[PDB]
Design a protein around this ligand. Structure first.
Ligand code: HEC
Length: 104
């Protein structure tokens, strides 16, 4: 996906609750550094819902594509407020950005 378009989506839809830099602060939502290849609910120092904590999936392209379309459907009970991104290409672009930034 397109990293620059993804970064724009992140800034407008995600940065108000999340950081992505290594050891970046928690905000309303957990810091997302190291997300890829890790189970749900594993950001050190963040207090997750049991729902998020116990979803038992690994974050990766496939699971984020589904989740970001409709978070509350994928993790019923989540405390994350976000309707969803309808467009597959927008999801891909965002995920490409996240794959870059959360791995810096
Ligand atoms: C913009 C589209 C995003 C994206 C890419 C993510 N979020 Fe959030 N988020 C918020 C909170 C409170 C949580 C914890 C939910 C809970 O404990 O029930 C989350 C969680 C996530 C995750 C899962 C992290 C994990 O380690 O399992 C992911 C991948 C994620 N978010 C991505 C809070 C917010 C917001 C507050 C109003 C909004 C806006 C966003 N998140 C937006 C996004």
């Amino acid at each position: 996906g397109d990293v620059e378009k993804g970064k724009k989506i992140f800034v407008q839809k995600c940065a108000q609750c999340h950081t992505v830099e290594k050891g970046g602060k928690h905000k309303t939502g957990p810091n997302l550094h190291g997300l890829f290849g890790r189970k749900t609910g594993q950001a050190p120092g963040f207090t997750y819902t049991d729902a998020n904590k116990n979803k038992g999936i690994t974050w990766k392209e496939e699971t984020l594509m589904e989740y970001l379309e409709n978070p509350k459907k994928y993790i019923p009970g989540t405390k994350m407020i976000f309707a969803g991104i309808k467009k597959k290409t927008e999801r891909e672009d965002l995920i490409a950005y996240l794959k870059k930034a959360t791995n810096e």
